[PDB]
Symmetry: C3
Subunit: 53 residues, 3 copies
Amino acid sequence: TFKIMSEKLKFTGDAMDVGGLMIKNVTPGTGDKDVVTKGQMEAFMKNWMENKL
Amino acid sequence: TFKIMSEKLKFTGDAMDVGGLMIKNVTPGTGDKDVVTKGQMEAFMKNWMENKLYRIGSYYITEEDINPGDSISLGFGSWAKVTGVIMGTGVVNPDGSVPNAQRVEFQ
Amino acid sequence: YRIGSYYITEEDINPGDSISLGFGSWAKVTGVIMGTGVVNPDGSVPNAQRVEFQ
């Protein structure tokens, strides 16, 4: 962990990682691929295209 | 911090966070519940729930109900909406009386 | 077919800003019937197809 960040040497705006942070567990904050699934549930099941639409 | 940093032990993909990050105010990246509100307003205020729009549903619940989206004021609509047009503009109908249509006029 | 009371183009910044917006005349009729057929219910010959002018 320490050695890899040494070659970075540019972390000034906090993390600024070159990856995509492909891991997270829960919360409406950092968004995983479930945001798209969450969006279509809100759009179809309960907000826009409700039952009998 | 070192103990919890060693506790996760799964540092392989650079950062490898475990937390949920519940301290934010406004940023182009991580967003609080405000991002949910932004999506709904775009889809409701100007996207789907347009002013004077007609919505058809099998449930007898208003759009402001807890079960429905629960946003904006919902009003019942009577009759259908037809685009403005003049009957017999091209004289296509033979032996037909010329009909006159008034814009924004209901009759 | 999309119906809205706002005089804003579908591609405009105020509208959804996607797809091409075209004026639509009359109301959309479900494909299966065309309306007036027979005084006593017998049914006339309906029309079908999309974009077809008949």
